[PDB]
Design a protein around this ligand. Sequence first.
Ligand SMILES: Nc1ncnc2c1ncn2[C@@H]1O[C@H](CSCC[C@H](N)C(=O)O)[C@@H](O)[C@H]1O
Length: 204
Amino acid sequence: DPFTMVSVDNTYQSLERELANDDPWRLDDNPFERERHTQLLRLSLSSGAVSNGLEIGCAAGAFTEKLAPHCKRLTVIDVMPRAIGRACQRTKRWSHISWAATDILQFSTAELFDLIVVAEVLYYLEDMTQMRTAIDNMVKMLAPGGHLVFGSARDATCRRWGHVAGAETVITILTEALTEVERVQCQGQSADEDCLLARFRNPE
Ligand SMILES: Nc1ncnc2c1ncn2[C@@H]1O[C@H](CSCC[C@H](N)C(=O)O)[C@@H](O)[C@H]1O
C-alpha cells in the first residue's frame, strides 16, 4: 500500500527532524519498535553480561537505556550531536557510558568490543562502498570472541524509503567476514514494519 513520509534535502536534515520529535522514530510508543528492541536485547544478552559494548546510532537512547545495565563499559556513537544529547540525558544514572558524535565511517578507535549493536542505521549511508567501509570498520573493532548484533528493515522497504540496501544485502556482506550464529524476523502492522535481525560471531 502507498505511504507518506517527511521529505528533506539530505540525510542530515532527515535525522535532525526525527531527533526533534518528542519520540524519535516512535521507538518508545510503537509496539513493533518495542518488540524489535526486545529481540535486539535478547540477541545482545545471548552470551550473558558484556565487558565492553559499542552501540552505533542511539536516537533518543531508548535502546541505550535497555543495554547499559548489562555492559561493564558501553561506548555509543552517533553522527548527530542532538542524538548524543537526548540519549545521555536518558541514561544519566549510569557512570560507565562514553559517547562520540561521529559518523561510523570516521570512527577510529584502538578499542575492541565484545558486543557491537548496529540497528536501523547502516541504510543512511549513501552507497554500497560506504556500507562495506563501515562494515570493515565494525569487523575490525570486534574483539577476538565478540558478537555483532545487526538489525535492519528489509532491502525492499529500504529502497521504498529512498535508501540503497537493507537487511538481506548487509547480512550477505557481514557473512563474508563473520559467522552467522542466529537470526530473527520482526513484523508489525505494515510492509514498513518488517525487520531482519542477525547475531554474528567473530571467527577469531
Ligand atoms: N552514518 C552514521 N554514523 C553513526 N550514526 C548514524 C549514522 N547515520 C545515522 N545515524 C544515527 O543512527 C540512528 C538511527 S535510529 C536507530 C537507533 C537504535 N539503533 C535503534 O534501533 O533503536 C540515529 O540516532 C541517527 O542519527
